[PDB]
Structure formats: structure tokens, C-alpha cells
Structure 1
Amino acid sequence: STGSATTTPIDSLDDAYITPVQIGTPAQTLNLDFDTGSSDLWVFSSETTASEVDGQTIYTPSKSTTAKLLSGATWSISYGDGSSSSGDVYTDTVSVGGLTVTGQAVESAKKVSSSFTEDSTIDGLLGLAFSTLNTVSPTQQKTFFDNAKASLDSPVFTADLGYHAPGTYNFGFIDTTAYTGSITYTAVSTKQGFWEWTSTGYAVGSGTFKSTSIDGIADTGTTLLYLPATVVSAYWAQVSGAKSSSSVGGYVFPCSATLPSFTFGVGSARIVIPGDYIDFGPISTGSSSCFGGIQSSAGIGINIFGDVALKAAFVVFNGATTPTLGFASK
């Protein structure tokens, strides 16, 4: 089997991407944030505290003839950005782009933190990291991809995120018309439950490539590119007037600037992030100070190849017995 679904930016800055997902019988379609950095499929629901729902579409398990309460199961997750959610668990039929899993754990939120409430466009998350990170207790549950894998034509999914435009998540096949050149594959460590890999270096604009190992995670659920402070300083030093602002929370730059590109290595291959992808717009409405798309990972504990990096590539998440990642230009 295969599936194919369009993923759409939630706003004009590409702050996140939503993909429609069918849950239950008859189908209830929710727009979920596919997150290769976590492993829970959780949704706003009829059980979510009412004051914490503000415009999201909810899953109502009592209206699904295939929903079954997973007796005794609870979940609670805290994300690296400080947001969180928790609740109870159903199993139900879940379909993405024509690919169907029966018996998928659907984690129904009783509580969500304020950042989720305040984002009316995200109805929940669909985790695509390794199932070892799933938070359901006392019986850990499998991700949608893990449940589908054995049925897929090939045990893979691909992320093709657009810049200020829709893109595609495919399951079970590699669309050879979606990228240019060849796909370069690179090794993955699953030891921390992430799609963790080692980039071979970077360049800033037309500068010379610096060969250096950068261990990080391919994370579709993180907006920006988080890299070591040395690399990030070298980038922003090429932008007149850019500076790290402790009060704003990262590097800011004059909105009048033309940003240089940023290149990252995948083996001997090179992915080029155009400068425009690194502009996240005014820090507050009407300001002439703009927020940078490349930020330091120093306070995080891991480097993160988030959407800013991944949208510049066609990315293969290869879930074969030994997982790997593939990157192609597009």
C-alpha cells in the first residue's frame, strides 16, 4: 500500500505545516502537525477542557463506531518548546492520504497548554519519530508509520515541505519526479528515539564549505534551524546589523536586509537553503526588526534540522531494519 497527502503552511511565515487526517467511522477529518521529532498521535477532542479549545476541530470518539477506549491508558507529553498536553487513549481507524491503519492509538487531549489553544489551525500532532518515545502508559503505543510499515510497498515516508507553498507527505514510495539529481543517504542513530544524523559541514552564502561534523535531528515539527553557536555566529556576521537579542530570544536582523543562503552537507552532497527561507518577519507587528530562521542550539542540548532546512530538500525517512535518511535537492 501507499499514501499521499498534501501538507499546507499554517500562515504566511511557514510557522508549521498541517496535513488532513481521517479518524474514525464515519471519518472525522482533523488537520494535524506531522512531527518527526515526537511519537504521539494526539488530538483536540470532545474531552478537552472547554476553556482550552478556541477554534480547533475536535475528535468525538463517541460518534465513531470503530473507536474503543484503551482501558487504563493515559498520556502526557512535554515538548522542547515548553508546550504540553495530556489525556486518555482510544484506538480507532486512521487514514492519511489513502493509507489506512486500523487499531491506531489516538490520544485524546483532556488538557493542552496555552500555545496549542492559541493556535486555531492545529488540531493535534501526528508523531513520526521512533515508537520508543511514545508517552502512553502503562502500555506504550506505536506510531502511525510503525503500524503501517509492514503493509507499505517500501518501509519509508518522505517529506517534501514547500516554501510559502503546499508540499507533500508520501508513505510507502519515493516519487522520483519530486527531486533533482540523486538522493544521498546518510546513517541514523535511533539511540535517543529521533531521526538523528551527522551533517558533514556548512557554508554561508558563496563562502567556502567548512567540513565539520554536526550531529542533529531531522524534525518536521520544529520551525527553525538550530545549530551550534559558532556556526550561527558565522552566518549572522554576514548580515549587516544582525545581532543576538536576549530580550527577543535569538538573532534578529534589519528587515531591509537581503539574507545570504546557507548550505549544509549530507555526505559529499550539499543542500542549499536560499536566504529568503531564513526570514521569519517582524519580531512584532510593524517592527523593522526581523526574526532569524537560523538560531543557536546552545540551550537545547541537540541540533535541530527543522523546517527551514528540510523545506530546502526532498527528505526520505527510511524505516528499514537499519534506518537511514536521504536528502535530495529539488
Structure 2
Amino acid sequence: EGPYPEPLVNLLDVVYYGPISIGTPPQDFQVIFDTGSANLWLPSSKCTTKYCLHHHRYDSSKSSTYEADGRNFTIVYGSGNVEGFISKDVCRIGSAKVSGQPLGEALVVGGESLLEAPFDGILGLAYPSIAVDGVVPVFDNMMKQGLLGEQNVFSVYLNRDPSSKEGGEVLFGGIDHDHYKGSITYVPVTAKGYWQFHVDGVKSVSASKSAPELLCKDGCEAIADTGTSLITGPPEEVDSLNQYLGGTKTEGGQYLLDCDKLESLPNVTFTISGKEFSLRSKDYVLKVNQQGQTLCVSGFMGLEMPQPLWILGDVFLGPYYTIFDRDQDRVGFAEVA
């Protein structure tokens, strides 16, 4: 039946993570809930690296419900990588008890974003078609076990104010109208892997510029990815968008904005299923501290994908409450409440 509300912590508007347990008795972890990947993994007790010793580790030998598998697994992310071996155990999210859940026991991890993370691992919520080693994803296993009843969706709220107490929620098996206003706009999934769909256009129309900036001019593809902080796009288009906004880059992976000029920045709008989804500069500028300085990072970054697409990460998924619907293979967006 359910539904199962999973509460999230918001670290600096860049990552969101929540509690799970594995095994019998429960071993507790924090994981990022990631609609851009399909695998669950945690650091192994068989790992004694600096990384593993400063995170929560899974010890199969203390779990009476553990079952061995032992296949090698390797996963590559935009911001890191992981390798280890597969095991299977009970996985709990709130009051949901997900039996026989494959997980990766991580032995080697790379990427600062993972190595210094406040979370222990990643719980993928993408389609099973992209699961490394073909192992059943958590949500798929919930559906197989009938834990959502007849409502095989999950809905994500991300708070974009890190000073606020409640970071966010993943609601398994429901849509909470107390997290949105108006009506949901749905878009059908195209390629089932990521939560991928067609976008009609992307634009910015400044009051201070003679011309608008019209991107994704002939339509484009996008994904909804809770595990991406910003919005990514085809580099050529993101370069131009940042030029229109006054973003500059001579190092790193992001464009920077003058922190004293943010109030003059125009909205940027994504048109999806014929409806406009606007982002104010308050929505798309991320405060970051690096190397002793406060920066204002443009929330539009370039990323070349195998087939060009835009990744709509937390910058978008905060102001728009998002419904991930596996009964109808569609994504819903509504203005957050």
C-alpha cells in the first residue's frame, strides 16, 4: 500500500540525501536518490581506504538476511566512479521493507564529489534498462513486491533554501498536492533509460537586450535528474546562453556571474508540452565557496552527451515538483508550493 515518505537533507543546494537501512538487524546509511542512474551501492566493510573508514560501511557478516552474489560491478558517473562486487539483502525506506535487493559493495571510489560526500552511496531511480549488471533497481523491486499498491509513481520535492529545516522528500507511491500549486503538466518518456523526454524550446528574454536568446530552437531532448545539481546542456548552446547572461569561464566546469549584478539577470524558460517553465536568477544562480572565495555560479553548464540532451537537475527540480510515473512512462511537472 504505502505511500512511503523519504525525508531529504539539503547540503548547500548541491546535493540531497536521505536515510536507508540494509540488512537484519538494520545497518543505517545516507544515500543520494538519483533519477539519473539505476544502481544501489554502499561502501563495503571489506574496504579499509580513507574513504571507507570515514563513511558508513555495509557488513554482510552481521546480517542474517544477506545473500552472496559476488559479480564485479563498475559504474561511471559524471562526477565520479565506483567499483566493487554485488550482494543482496533487505533494503528499508521508511516503513517499506524491500526484500532481496541487490546492492553494490564498493571497494574503489573515485571523484571528490563522492569521496568527500556527506552521503555513503547512491540509490538509483532510473529505468532498469541502464542498471549495471542488470540488477533490479530498488523502485522496480518495490513494484514487483506490490508495495505501492496501484500507484507506481514517486514524486520529488527539493527545497531550494538550504537555511530551511526540511531539505526535500522522495514520496514513494504517491503525489502530494501539498507540495505543488496549480495542475500537473505531463510529458511522455521517449527513450526508457534515463527519465528522458522531448523539450519544445529554451529561451531568455531580457528587458535590457534588444534581442532574445532562443535555444533548443528546433526542439531537443532532456532528462529529469535529481542527482545532477545544475542544468546541463549541449556545450554550444550553453556557451551562448551564458554569453547572453554575462557568464564567463577561464577555468573549471562552470560559468561565473558577477555577484553584484545578479538582480539584472533575465529569467530563463523551458517550454515542455507547450507550457512555459520559468527560472528566475534566484532559481538558477548557485552560491559556491571555493579556494577561500564566494562565487556566483551560473546554473547552466555544458555537458556533451552521446546524443545531445539537457539534464534538468536540482536547479529545475526544486521550483518544479516532479512526478516520475512508471505506470504510464511519463514525467509530470508542477509549480512547487
| Length-normalised TM-score, structure 1 | 0.88
> For residue 182 of structure 1, what is the aligned residue in structure 2?
183
Percent identical pairs in the alignment equals: 29
- Pick from 81, 85, 93: which aligns with 1:88? 85
- Of 203-212 and 294-303, deviating more is 203-212
> For residue 110 of structure 1, what is the aligned residue in structure 2?
107
1-side partners of 2:248 and 2:316: how far apart? Answer: 21
1:209-231: CA deviation from partner (whole Å, max 9, x where unpaired): 95641201111111110123454
2-side partners of 1:106 and 1:299: how far apart? Answer: 27
- Of 270-279 and 152-161, deviating more is 270-279
Q: 1:326 deviation in Å? A: 0.7
1:212-223 map, 5 Å: 212-223=218-229
2-side partners of 1:221 and 1:299: how far apart? Answer: 16
**Matched AA of 2:51:** E
2-side partners of 1:308 and 1:282: how far apart? Answer: 14
Q: Is the 8 A contact 2:238 2:300 kept in 1?
A: yes
**Matched AA of 1:185:** Y
1:131-280 map, 5 Å: 131-136=128-133, 140-150=134-144, 151=146, 152-153=148-149, 154-165=151-162, 166-191=167-192, 193-204=193-204, 210=214, 212-229=218-235, 231-240=237-246, 242-245=247-250, 247-258=251-262, 259-280=265-286
1:134-164: CA deviation from partner (whole Å, max 9, x where unpaired): 112xxx2110011112411301111111103
- Of 19-28 and 259-268, deviating more is 259-268
Q: 1:276 deviation in Å? A: 2.1
Q: 1:200 deviation in Å? A: 1.6
Q: Is the 8 A contact 1:239 1:257 kept in 2?
A: no
2-side partners of 1:29 and 1:181: how far apart? Answer: 37
**Matched AA of 1:46:** S
Q: 1:114 deviation in Å? A: 4.1
- Of 262-271 and 228-237, deviating more is 228-237
Q: Is the 8 A contact 1:93 1:104 kept in 2?
A: yes
Q: Is the 8 A contact 1:52 1:114 kept in 2?
A: no
Please provide the CA RMSD for this pair: 2.3
**Matched AA of 2:109:** V
| Distance change (3 Å), C-alpha of 1:164 and 1:230 | same
2-side partners of 1:263 and 1:100: how far apart? Answer: 40
2-side partners of 1:283 and 1:290: how far apart? Answer: 9
Which SS does the other structure have where 1:48 is aligned?
Answer: coil
| Length-normalised TM-score, structure 2 | 0.87
Q: 1:184 deviation in Å? A: 0.7
Q: 1:314 deviation in Å? A: 0.8
| Distance change (3 Å), C-alpha of 1:308 and 1:54 | farther
2-side partners of 1:155 and 1:264: how far apart? Answer: 27
> For residue 29 of structure 2, what is the aligned residue in structure 1?
30
> For residue 121 of structure 1, what is the aligned residue in structure 2?
118
Unaligned runs of 5+ in 1: none
- Pick from 323, 328, 331: which aligns with 1:325? 331
Q: Is the 8 A contact 2:9 2:18 kept in 1?
A: yes
Task: Please say if 1:74 is aligned against 2:80.
Answer: no
**Matched AA of 1:232:** V
Q: 1:288 deviation in Å? A: 5.9
Q: Is the 8 A contact 1:55 1:120 kept in 2?
A: no
1-side partners of 2:90 and 2:40: how far apart? Answer: 12
1-side partners of 2:71 and 2:32: how far apart? Answer: 23
**Matched AA of 1:182:** S
Q: Is the 8 A contact 2:324 2:330 kept in 1?
A: yes
Which SS does the other structure have where 2:241 is aligned?
Answer: helix
Q: Is the 8 A contact 2:191 2:197 kept in 1?
A: no
Unaligned runs of 5+ in 2: none
Q: Is the 8 A contact 1:149 1:156 kept in 2?
A: no
| Distance change (3 Å), C-alpha of 1:212 and 1:181 | farther
1:286-305 map, 5 Å: 286-287=292-293, 289-298=295-304, 301-305=308-312
Which SS does the other structure have where 1:129 is aligned?
Answer: coil
| Distance change (3 Å), C-alpha of 1:65 and 1:116 | farther
Aligned pairs, number: 319
